[PDB]
Amino acid sequence: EKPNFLIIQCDHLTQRVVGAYGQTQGCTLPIDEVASRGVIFSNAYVGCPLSQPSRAALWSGMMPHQTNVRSNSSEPVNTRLPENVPTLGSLFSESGYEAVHFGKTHDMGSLRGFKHKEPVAKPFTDPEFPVNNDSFLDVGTCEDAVAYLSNPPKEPFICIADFQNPHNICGFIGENAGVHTDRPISGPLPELPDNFDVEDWSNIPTPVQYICCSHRRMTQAAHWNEENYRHYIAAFQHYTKMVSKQVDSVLKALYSTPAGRNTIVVIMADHGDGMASHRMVTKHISFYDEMTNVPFIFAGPGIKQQKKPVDHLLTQPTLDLLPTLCDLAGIAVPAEKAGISLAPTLRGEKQKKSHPYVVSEWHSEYEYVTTPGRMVRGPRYKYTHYLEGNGEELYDMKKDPGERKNLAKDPKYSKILAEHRALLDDYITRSKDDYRSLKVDADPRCRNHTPGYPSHEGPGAREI
Ligand SMILES: [Cl-]
Ligand SMILES: [Zn+2]
């Protein structure tokens, strides 16, 4: 009849690690099996590479400057979503769907309309990698979703399973902070990425120069060697395999009932992880693909299999998931929502409405450093601007997908730069963005040493 929906979201999950995108084998087989039945987008940019802003934005179908959840800080710095704002869950709930949510919330009110159940951490010992409450909560989340999908009560439903992993990578970094010899592992060690090194630190913006100061985990990884970073990637894959096994459990529960086959499965992330690219660990300030270009996978009744990743559209899950699911469910979407339904692409029809560019925002994490930034991703180039120092990046995503050569200061590229600044102005105007009025709050002690993370000195912005 009317379709059910199962949204499986993972914190930190990256395209590179997901086999469906063609770079890594062996980490996400169950996700790749869903993908093979359906469609995956190659350009799927989140409106902010940080948990709370992305999630606030996602489930209300807005951008972060509009929700006013621009960091992981609570009220009053950030504002909870008012109950008069339509939401994925209110839209679906008001139409007669049962709407349930399991796992990580971190939503600041944007989950309104979902009946939420809190997972209970179920601890266990891993013999090779550090595991913590992130991993343990996921055992609970998985048990909750399994029990629900193994017996609904009832249909039509929409269900979200919000997993923590591979977020446990953060705990790994803390256990392996600073100069160190790595704990031996039994796997083959993954190679560093081709974009690992930063070739010229003078040619990236001030806030990116000093992520080692403002970001605790960059502080902790600042002086790591190549073995260290390669163990970081092995651990990322481990936690990715861990959550994939839970995705597998949840899907087995889905298809153990007749409801399963009438269910549209979406698989995504709120943001990704640096994975050593550009020396990065986790996420902070920067807009590189590793962090802002997430897995975005659909399969189910009425969605046509496409073997080739959709790479001719710029997608923005943060905006587009709300309209896409509402479309497929036959629910009217409030005209103020700026997202675009991908349901035509998913049904194997031509996509006549599409995003001419997609955007991402940075503000702060916990308001130690406030250094607002904006990314504009056009059909071919990615442009970056930061207020602090008026820094700019410009990257050729066709010939330099690894983002190793900033072209912003290359005269050959000035009309391309002008054109992309002009898109940012378009975004700022149409979205009512206050970017240009915003103030930096970046202590000079966090901009002290020579640019770049290996040259980092001191404890970082934590003090104070
Ligand atoms: Cl911060
Ligand atoms: Zn530093």
From Swiss-Prot:
Q: Which keywords does this Swiss-Prot/TrEMBL entry list?
A: Hydrolase, Metal-binding, Zinc
Q: Which residues cross the membrane?
A: none
Q: Name one Pfam family in it.
A: Sulfatase
Is DNA repair tagged as a keyword?
A: no
Where does the record place the modification 3-oxoalanine (Ser)? 51
Instruction: Give its E.C. classification number.
Output: 3.1.6.-
Describe how it is modified after translation: The conversion to 3-oxoalanine (also known as C-formylglycine, FGly), of a serine or cysteine residue in prokaryotes and of a cysteine residue in eukaryotes, is critical for catalytic activity.
Select a single GO molecular function from the record's annotations and give it: metal ion binding
Q: Which InterPro entries match?
A: Alkaline_phosphatase_core_sf (IPR017850), GAG-degrading_sulfatase (IPR051849), Sulfatase_N (IPR000917)
Please list the residue ranges that the record marks as compositionally biased, kind Basic and acidic residues.
Answer: 459-464
The lineage's top-level taxon is: Bacteria
The UniProt annotation places Zn(2+) binding at: 212-213, 449, 456
Cofactor(s) this protein cannot do without: Zn(2+)
Residue span of region Disordered? 440-464
Keyword Transmembrane helix belongs to the record: no
**Which family does the UniProt entry place this protein in?**
Belongs to the sulfatase family.
Its biological purpose is as follows: Exosulfatase involved in the degradation of the glycosaminoglycans (GAGs) chondroitin sulfate (CS), dermatan sulfate (DS) and heparan sulfate (HS). 2-O-sulfatase active on unsaturated non-reducing end hexuronate units. Has a slight preference for HS-derived structures. GAG-specific sulfatases play a key role in the persistence of the major human gut symbiont B.thetaiotaomicron in the host gastrointestinal tract.
Protein name (database record): Delta 4,5-hexuronate-2-O-sulfatase
> What is the native source organism of this protein?
Bacteroides thetaiotaomicron (strain ATCC 29148 / DSM 2079 / JCM 5827 / CCUG 10774 / NCTC 10582 / VPI-5482 / E50)
